Design a protein around this ligand. Structure first.
Ligand SMILES: c1ccc([As+](c2ccccc2)(c2ccccc2)c2ccccc2)cc1
Ligand SMILES: c1ccc([As+](c2ccccc2)(c2ccccc2)c2ccccc2)cc1
Ligand SMILES: [Cl-]
Ligand SMILES: [Cl-]
Lengths: 144, 144
């Protein structure tokens, strides 16, 4: 299902990392956020939905989606919560693994996170990359 | 040329808006940044290059790309500066136009910017939208 995304937060170095995964492809979008709050979640959701066709979002922490600010962002962008596993578990530990490997390539964690996203999305696995798969899935979906 | 992006900053309400446009499609990515600095430009460049295949970036303010931090981000991500107009002028005023129209739909400007990106990218112009065009262009490019 091409419009389904998974969104969670993880923690590293006293900071919070919001990680979104496009389920059908394994492509990730991530941001280091200053605090685990509804405001940050809502702003990220609105940003993502303007960049990719987001129809439903799943999470492993349902409480992350209860705040008025998150519900208003889902309302405006027309997102609904996905009510129904292997891919997502493998992308987050793999993201932390890649972060660990490039941590010394930047001063700040936020920089290393985006180096990790870049490596993850371009890594051919075979054997296309997640980046190649999301664009194929969406482009195929557009054309009927 | 599918890997070319244009990046500039604009100003509204005492704030700075970084606007990136994928030249061949008119798709936009934008962020309200706290300051017009090399650090913010570099972080945005690294983020963008992990999400789309960025080969060259053009700007209407060449000085925006001279800081060690921006050059290091371009080095790491393998981006080069594009050395060689209608589309970009039409997207920024159009973004400010859409922002003006939704400004009262959110408290903060940063929220309205991302509502404006969302509307812009989904607007069918015919007659596909910029979002549809970038995915078609990239997916076509991948497959030879
Ligand atoms: C490999 C080696 C060095 C960096 As550099 C850097 C800065 C502090 C500690 C360790 C590495 C870097 C550039 C941009 C953003 C984050 C880190 C770096 C290396 C050479 C010239 C400029 C910057 C990246 C990859
Ligand atoms: C993010 C930014 C704005 C809203 As609204 C609102 C509009 C004007 C000033 C302040 C907030 C909102 C409406 C209803 C319930 C919750 C939030 C909003 C109102 C009307 C149209 C679009 C958005 C929601 C989420
Ligand atoms: Cl850094
Ligand atoms: Cl707001």
């Amino acid at each position: 299902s091409p419009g389904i995304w998974q969104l969670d937060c993880t923690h590293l170095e006293g900071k919070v990392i919001l990680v979104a995964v496009h389920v059908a492809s394994g492509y990730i979008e991530a941001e280091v956020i200053p605090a685990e709050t509804g405001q940050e979640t809502a702003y990220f959701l609105l940003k993502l939905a303007g960049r990719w066709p987001v129809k439903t979002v799943h999470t492993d922490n349902g409480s992350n989606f209860t705040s008025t600010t998150v519900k208003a962002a889902c309302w405006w962008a027309g997102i609904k919560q996905e009510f129904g596993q292997g891919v997502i578990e493998s992308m987050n530990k793999e993201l932390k693994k890649i972060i660990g490997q490039v941590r010394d390539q930047a001063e700040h964690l936020k920089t290393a996170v985006q180096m990790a996203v870049f490596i993850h999305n371009k890594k051919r696995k075979g054997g296309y990359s997640a980046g190649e798969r999301i664009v194929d899935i969406i482009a195929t979906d557009i054309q009927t």
